[model samples]
Target: MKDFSKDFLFGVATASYQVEGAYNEDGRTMSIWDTFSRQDGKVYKSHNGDVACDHYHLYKDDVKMMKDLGIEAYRFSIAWPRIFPAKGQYNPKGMDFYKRLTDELLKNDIKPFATIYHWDLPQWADDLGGWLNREIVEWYGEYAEKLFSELGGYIKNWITLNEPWCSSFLSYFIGEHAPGHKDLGEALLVSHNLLLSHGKAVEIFRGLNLDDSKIGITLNLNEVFPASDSDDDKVAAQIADGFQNRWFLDPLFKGKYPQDMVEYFGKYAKVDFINDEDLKLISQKLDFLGVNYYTRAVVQKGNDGLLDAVQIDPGNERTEMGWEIYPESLYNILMRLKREYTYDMPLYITENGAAFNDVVEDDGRVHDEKRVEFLKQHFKEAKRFLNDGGNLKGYFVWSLMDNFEWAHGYSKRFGIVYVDYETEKRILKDSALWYKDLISTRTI
Candidate 1:
């Protein structure tokens, strides 16, 4: 077994929309997701986060759960709409909740890593064109500034955005997520705008001159594996990597977009949006990268949605969520991100965990042995990567409690704690106990 460095940080992670249930509260208005999830046939069984785990009112108990788990850090997101309900107004009441949460984490002696935006855009912003407008770069920068001014002292590590690929393509191109709109041109435009917004916000953060502050972004990265050794399949894998991983990482580290992405989106992109100094700004030195990895895509040459690649069936061990259980892919992605893009930067497994059909036994406990084994296997791979000189600094499980999943809704459970939404009851699953033991001992 590989031994992880003693100073490596370990934690659990969640986003506001996924956990915080107070959809409409003190000065908090609707977000694009709040609007999208209400549409007929949008979410699973039309389930939205209207009452998702009620974390808005129950965060004290949530902090207790985190403390009990013995994690050194807790990475969570603040809802954009909650903080700024209007287009540009500061909602004090909305900010108070996060202030309280951060205080709780600090009081518990857990380091707080705050993601400023987790894909929840205020409905007013969506009405004003959301990520399509270039003005959003400034708007997001202002928002980041507000957060830094208010929460920077308590939260030093700030993730400007989370998974822009899902925010752009999944939400805009495929119409599978919030503010669902399926237009190829709009999707391309929003994608660029989101990346630009991240870069602009990072620049704004540098101006604050705060102590111990770090600015970065989280991306949903997957290692692409070609189905066979065919040239077409190999090229397909390369294209997949370009569109998903390199499209973001390259520009942020190498000061240029992936050459293949430029070719792939040539017809749709104007290229005028990017200027001479934009790449330098986008590639501004990053302190760390938050990688939200789930599973890898086994690709074969095929015409699917918009890319030159398609997902192929691997016929391997599958999780209850239907995602393939391939821990080696995590190692592959870590190695690629280190050797190919940011060689010296640190990395955190921001979101990593499996969803299972967890059953609460008669003993009033949820038994998730599958999740335990899943985490143990993946941690082994993570330890191996760090041992080989990867700057893998932290690991955060995808969720602390089962809450509202976006498109899949309440049907999928990805939490270490089992939540009885109907009764607002919370039960820590067996995996949480296993994780606590690992963190307590700093070993498997």
Candidate 2:
């Protein structure tokens, strides 16, 4: 038998662009996601978050649903485009929406965990070169300062940025996310500016000295494995590990870039962006770390000279997203972090869970046994970590409800609740019920 601590929070998460679907309403302007999803061949079937779940107009109901389901917290993001429609432009109406959302959450007794940024960069920022330009550091600071001063009283747990890897590397290099640009040099610079922006935000938060509040950044991490014991594959996995995990971890925890990957990436881009003050600003003390874990990757050396690590599937059970179901990596990653980098920093599994093809059955129940098992296995892993005296404080499932999944669009569902997008109805899946029981018992 395993149980989470009494204070171990059970929560759900969603990004602004993915759920709050009043795209152009209430003084909200275009975000990069708004631009990217509208472009031809960008999102699946050209689908967009134009009216995703209509959460903007229905957050009160959503909060009530969480309360009914016994969810302890709600992790949500503030849309930069909504908060600041244009450069230096502050929208009171956009801020008002979040204020209302938090107020509703408080009323429902669900803790509101706010993420300052989650890849929904304001389009105006993109016009000014977005994360590529260092000016965004100040712009992000301005945005963070606004949210902290306005809502800091209500929301205490804050995340500086969600998944910088996706924001920088995935967006710029992989070209799978918004403001898609396929350039390694641009991605590296974007990653640097993003880290700077995170540091700037932390600096501002520390300056405020808000009561009962703490801040950190969320990293989507995975344990990378070598396809075999071959020397080339081992080398490939190391580079992939550094590329995915240590690139951001080293700076936030160790105050420097990973030298191995830095040299590897150096062949493509110069590290001239590094300055004396940059590392100091990037490595400020953080209060906690939010980890979003889903699956692991096994890679072999790619023939291509550029970052030659190619992921391979070894005939494992998969999700709707084609991601392999490897729950052991959850414990593997947490142990690695505790042993190496984090060393007892308060940690939260800010995002876990999986995507599955969920369909409502004739009996009017949306049964997602796979998701129930996924959560069970992952939560058991977390419990093991906690039992071993790891500083695992909480767990927030990847999403609250099915909304717009980036690139894949509405095709993927990571929520425990089933969403009927056509009628804007939410039916609790078996996983949600299972979660309710788990939260009530605090055990597995």
Give the clashing pairs for model 2.
Answer: none
Best by lDDT: 2
Compared with the true structure, what per-residue lDDT tens digits does model 1 show for residues 97-168?
Answer: 989999998999889999988888989998988898888888888888888898887898999889988898
Candidate 1 clashing pairs? none
Off by over 4 Å in 2: none
TM per candidate: 0.97, 0.98
Q: In candidate 1, where is summed lDDT lowest over 10 consecutive residues?
A: 267-276
